[PDB]
Each structure stands twice: as C-alpha cells, then as structure tokens.
Curated annotation (Swiss-Prot):
InterPro entries: Endolysin_T4_type (IPR034690), Glyco_hydro_24 (IPR002196), Lysozyme-like_dom_sf (IPR023346), Lysozyme_dom_sf (IPR023347), Phage_lysozyme-like (IPR052619), T4-type_lysozyme (IPR001165). PANTHER family: T4-TYPE LYSOZYME 1-RELATED. It is found in: Host cytoplasm. This is Endolysin. Changing S117F: 10-fold decrease in enzymatic activity.
C-alpha cells in the first residue's frame, strides 16, 4: 500500500464531472475543479487543467495525471508549511501518508488548524490524537473515510485499508 493507492481508495475514479460530498464540481480522483455552482465554470476549469476541450469528459490517463500533480502539490504544501513540516518530519512512513491524505482532502490550511491533534501527534500520543481528530466536522461529514485515516494515524499500519 502507498499514498497513491490509499487515496485512490478514498476518492475513487470518475471520468465525468461530478459533485463531491460538499456539492462541488469535481473530476477524476478527487480533483476539485470549482466551488462555483456553474457547470460551465467547472467545464472551463477542466479544459484549463487539461489543455483541451474536454466537454467535461477525460481519459484515465488524464485523470491519473491530475492525481499525480495533486499528490505532489499536497506534499510540497506540507513541506512549505511551518506548522505542518515539523510534524511530518517527526513521523514514520505510514503515518506520513495519513497526513498527506488529510491535506489532499482538506487543504494545507484546513489541516494546519488541527493544532491540538498536531501537537499530540508530534508527542507520539496516538490514542489521544485519534480521539481529538474525531471531534471535527470532518469526521462527522465523511466518517467512514475519517475513520480509516484516523486509524492509520493511530496505529502506524495499513490495516484500515485491507
Ligand atoms: Cl490544475
Ligand atoms: Cl466517508
Ligand atoms: Xe494531525
């Protein structure tokens, strides 16, 4: 298992514009296109992202291309974030993937605000962190996903993904 396979599981793959859980126009493997309710806007963002007139439809490769770019951006966001970096660098490989997953989902910003959990994580207080993490809108809005990520963070293994 790895970060790619893990998020491919959490996000799925859709070759046509769709609305995510928040109602936002998305494509491929969780690639957000726009927060705007305009489908045309969304289609405009897609064409821009791909470099062609997609008509709101892309290939599997196209989708995996966007995915890679997105996973890369998520880690670089973490490494550039003053609050995130030190946590990340303190973690083992599996727990680092859990962190990247959250940032992919919620953005740098979103995650940099989990101050309390971030601290417990740095102290290696797995259980407490896990509990603090579940006290969030994130857990209450996508609980099965949140559970998987949290268990990963808590244990350091991929069992939630078997
Ligand atoms: Cl893009
Ligand atoms: Cl979920
Ligand atoms: Xe965290």
């Amino acid at each position: 298992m790895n970060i790619f396979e893990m998020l491919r599981i959490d996000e799925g793959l859709r070759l046509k514009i769709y609305k995510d859980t928040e109602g936002y126009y998305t494509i491929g493997i969780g690639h957000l296109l726009t927060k705007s309710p305009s489908l045309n806007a969304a289609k405009s963002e897609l064409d821009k992202a791909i470099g062609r007139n997609t008509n709101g439809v892309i290939t599997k490769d196209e989708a995996e291309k966007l995915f890679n770019q997105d996973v890369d951006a998520a880690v670089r966001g973490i490494l550039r974030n003053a609050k995130l970096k030190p946590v990340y660098d303190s973690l083992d490989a599996v727990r680092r993937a859990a962190l990247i997953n959250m940032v992919f989902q919620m953005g740098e910003t979103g995650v940099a605000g989990f101050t309390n959990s971030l601290r417990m994580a740095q102290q290696k207080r797995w259980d407490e962190a896990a509990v603090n993490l579940a006290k969030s809108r994130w857990y209450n809005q996508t609980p099965n996903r949140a559970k998987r990520v949290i268990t990963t963070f808590r244990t350091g293994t991929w069992d939630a993904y078997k």
